[PDB]
């Protein structure tokens, strides 16, 4: 009928098309986060120049709107128009999930939890190896780059193609690039765990595999992982901030990845965010924030956003591991 378990609202009728303009949006207050996209805006500025020339029009208006108070009843003043997303149910109720990027804990000598090894390219031998054997010690110990505390992070890096490792001494937080592959074909975890109705295929994501790997024993864990015999190894590379697909920094909280025939790279969202408790449940409440599409996604598609949280700990608590709703309004100057 009209769940509202996940954020979901019923307030603003019901949408006959993908956009449609609003006097004012549904949105009491002002952004929260103008500091944040006046940076975000900025490495547009310097890292896709072509990107910035072709919005700054509509960044150069958000800008002094909120420069003059950025409350949402003031933004015709400033030739800024609100077209309101139908979202997922025509509601205007518009899937939000969320992704972060992990600094993975590990050290150079297996001590206490950090039991879980990270390798460099080993010789051909070494490669026909499958996850199962690796993990049962196949490979050498001088392959081994580190040794996380956790296994299945480890996997969830196998799948980004790289992460970034702190090894808890003080020194430049360490990242790893993509180097090759064992010989075995990779097999879907997040398919094994549908069929198991470990979770349902609407809320698959990484998120959701990490998700069970917390909520699960080691044991557990690693007899889920063996079902991919698909193994990584990585090599040590220079460290670079995050980018998204478009190139450009992504700020914590004020950027998003989207479907680019939806939502093109460039495009200004004004949104009102479900916020989570610490057991990833919608508490309630929303945050109004102002972000850019600077990435995209394998399965971000439609108007589905993934909302970049940040880095570290806490952007991982933000993000949470299924979907959620908030109300999103794309914001253009009309010619």
Same mark, same amino acid.
Do not use: C
């Given at each position: ?25 549904? #949105? ?156 075995? #074909? ?63 920094? &992504? ?17 200004? &969202? ?66």
């Amino acid at each position: 009928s009209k769940p509202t378990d996940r954020g979901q609202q019923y307030k603003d009728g019901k949408f006959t098309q993908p956009f449609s303009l609003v006097n004012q949006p549904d #949105a009491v207050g002002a952004p929260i986060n103008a500091g944040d996209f006046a940076e975000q805006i900025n490495h547009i500025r310097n890292s896709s120049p072509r990107l910035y020339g072709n919005q700054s029009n509509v960044y150069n208006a958000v800008q002094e709107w909120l420069r003059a108070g950025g409350d949402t009843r003031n933004m015709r003043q400033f030739g800024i128009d609100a077209w309101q997303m139908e979202g997922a149910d025509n509601y205007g109720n518009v899937q939000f999930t969320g992704y972060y990027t992990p600094v993975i804990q590990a050290r150079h000598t297996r001590q206490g939890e950090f039991q879980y090894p990270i390798y460099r390219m080993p010789p051909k031998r070494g490669r026909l190896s499958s996850r199962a054997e690796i993990y049962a010690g196949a490979l050498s110990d001088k392959y081994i780059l580190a040794y996380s505390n956790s296994l299945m992070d480890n996997f969830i890096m196998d799948v980004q193609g790289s992460g970034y490792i702190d090894f808890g001494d003080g020194s430049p937080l360490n990242f790893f690039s993509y180097a090759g592959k064992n010989g075995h #074909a990779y097999r879907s975890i997040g398919k094994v765990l549908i069929d198991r109705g470990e979770v349902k295929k609407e809320d698959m994501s990484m998120q959701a595999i990490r998700h069970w790997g917390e909520t699960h024993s080691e044991a557990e864990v690693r007899e889920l992982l063996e079902q991919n015999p698909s193994f990584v190894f990585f090599k040590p590379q220079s460290f670079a901030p995050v980018k998204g697909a478009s190139a450009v920094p &992504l700020v914590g909280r004020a950027s998003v990845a989207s479907d680019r025939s939806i939502i093109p790279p460039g495009t200004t &969202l004004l949104a009102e965010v479900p916020l989570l408790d610490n057991n990833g449940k919608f508490n309630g409440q929303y945050e109004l924030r102002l972000m850019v599409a600077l990435d995209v996604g394998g399965a971000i598609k439609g108007q589905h956003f993934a909302i970049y949280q940040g880095i570290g700990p806490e952007a991982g608590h933000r993000a949470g591991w299924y979907n959620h709703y908030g109300r999103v309004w794309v914001l253009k100057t009309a010619p």
